[PDB]
Copies of this chain bind each other. A is one copy, B any other.
């Protein structure tokens, strides 16, 4: 047990939550994801994960998320046991995990209830990847978001990112803010109506981490100063019975051609998806519309994590 360094397993046994990652780990995972890009663009079929089986358990169905993981597995030469609709007499999640783990080498689970992923990881003796834990953690979304910024902008230190939309309740913007705080000289703009502003826990965490942040309800002003505009929807229900606030916000938190008109030439638009009319279809025609390149980057990040969890470094 004395062998060290080159004389190796991934330090994570499961991928469950953002707080598992530090800056050095992110940088190394992103290095692996760049290698996975090279593999996926090659004409030659990879055999890195030949002989390994992934079981997907989508209790909350997600065609996009599931296919990204299943594609990642097959692009590496692994195979897949698919369950696109795992929601179905007496079965705890723990009993399903303890059965399915006998049939597979890795489990990818998306659930509709927060807390499921931690329970599955604690139960399983094979690696678990959380593919979305109800409205809670979605760690590979956060990883692919940061990777996309690094790819598109060329750096993570010193950038300005606008987080737009349902900041109070949105796991994607909260988790992205959490990981960005691991880099240096980051400035975050929180753009939203007051009723869905970012909660104090993330604000206090950013301040404690030395991250500059600013709240604004003026998307046109913020977007002109940012490298990244990261958009999410504010659903009508989040205004509750306050129709006056819904009407005051109408048309004010949309990414449209006019917004792109004030943005820098090398800035980007991101969106974790699914996207509705909070990004207009016209925006898609702009090279700065990065949300489908972002989704593609999920393939490379998920390839990297499957490789690391199954065969290590």
Contacts and interface: CB of A to CB of B under 8 A. Distances in A.
A81 B273 CA distance: 19
A210 interface: no
A293 to B, nearest CB: 9
Contacts of A90: 233, 236, 274-277
A38 B83 CA distance: 27
Given A63-B86, A81-B74, A88-B61, A68 B103 contact: yes
Interface string A267-284: 000000111110001000
Nearest to A86: B63
A67 B83 contact: yes
Contacts of A88: 61-63, 85
A85 B83 contact: no
Interface residues of A, number: 52
Interface string A46-76: 0000110101010001111001101100110
Nearest to A298: B102
Indicate the member of A57, A80, A281 with the most B CB atoms within 10 Å: A80
A84 B85 contact: yes
A172 B21 CA distance: 46
